[PDB]
Write a protein that binds this ligand. Structure first.
Ligand SMILES: Nc1ncnc2c1ncn2[C@@H]1O[C@H](COP(=O)(O)O)[C@@H](OP(=O)(O)O)[C@H]1O
Ligand SMILES: Oc1ccc2ccccc2c1
Length: 289
């Protein structure tokens, strides 16, 4: 009940509240005009969510401020003390709907694949993911005790963390994109050049918008502005759920900062394990710009 342990479901370790959440998510019916944001945690979920809302409100910042990002974009598997569940919020979210998930394919509602819903997947280099994930486990108190960074890094390496293996995740959603319509984006690409990536998102969802407006989205989806913005920075939630004084949700927003956490030994060891997990995969990751 106090940083409870994970619960395994069909091979996926989950926050127990999210596992419970899968029951009522059995009753979820996807529409053809839905869009699923899919990511392994800490990969840029909130960032594309805010890009996709701004696209959906025609650039209108003021509408984007109607509520926090987690109410504008129902988080499918979500459940937590004192906050409405993904499924509850979904009931008051109007089509065309933006949905957020981290579920491995093993757990994904089949209705999203049968209905051919557009997915925007965001992948990020595992080193920055592990580091962000580690800080995230401290502030987001439903998560089990993270322990030392070292022991969290080893845990992360055998996917013995919330939502399981990053390795299997970025690969399985990469393969899905052959039989299913997936825009597969990279957080690093979004760091290098946010406007290229936003226009690709737009190409994907079929909106054209003017450059006055694009440029405008760019600036309002930057790290500095999304840190300032309380409908995107998660400071509106109760302190018993997320404690930003331990670690803020919007942390550094950088690519390449893993280097200030990983030791040299951790790095050599991670890289050897990495080359072995990722062998036979066309996927190429930039671990810095
Ligand atoms: N506008 C933005 N630009 C770059 N990174 C952003 C961002 N908004 C949030 N992030 C980062 O994306 C990560 C959160 O991902 P998710 O939303 O998938 O949980 C955090 O990274 P760090 O902890 O590396 O700073 C957060 O700082
Ligand atoms: O992607 C997310 C977002 C918010 C969360 C809050 C608590 C636990 C996991 C979470 C994962």
């Amino acid at each position: 009940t106090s940083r409870p342990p994970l619960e395994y479901v069909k091979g996926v370790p989950l926050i127990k509240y999210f596992a419970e959440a899968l029951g009522p998510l059995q009753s979820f019916q996807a529409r053809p005009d839905d869009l699923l944001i899919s990511t392994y945690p800490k990969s840029g979920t909130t960032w594309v969510s805010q890009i996709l809302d701004m696209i959906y409100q025609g650039g209108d910042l003021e509408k984007c401020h109607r509520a926090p990002i987690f109410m504008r974009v129902p988080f499918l598997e979500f459940k937590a003390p004192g906050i409405p569940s993904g499924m509850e919020t979904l009931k008051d979210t109007p089509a065309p709907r933006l949905l957020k998930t981290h579920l491995p394919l093993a757990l994904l509602p089949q209705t999203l694949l049968d209905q051919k819903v557009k997915v925007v997947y965001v992948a990020r280099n595992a080193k920055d993911v592990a580091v962000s994930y580690y800080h995230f486990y401290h502030m987001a108190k439903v998560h089990p005790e993270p322990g030392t960074w070292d022991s969290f890094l080893e845990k992360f390496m055998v996917g013995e963390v919330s939502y399981g293996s990053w390795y299997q995740h970025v690969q399985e959603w990469w393969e899905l994109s052959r039989t299913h319509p997936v825009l597969y984006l990279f957080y690093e690409d979004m760091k290098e050049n946010p406007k290229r990536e936003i226009q690709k998102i737009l190409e994907f969802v079929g909106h054209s918008l003017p450059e006055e407006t694009v440029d405008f989205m760019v600036q309002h989806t930057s790290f500095k502005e999304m840190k300032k913005n309380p409908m995107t920075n998660y400071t509106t939630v109760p302190q018993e759920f997320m404690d930003h004084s331990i670690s803020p949700f919007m942390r550094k927003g950088m690519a390449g900062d893993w280097k200030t956490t990983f030791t040299v030994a951790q790095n050599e060891r991670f890289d050897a394990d990495y080359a072995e997990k990722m062998a036979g995969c066309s996927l190429s990751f930039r671990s810095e710009l």
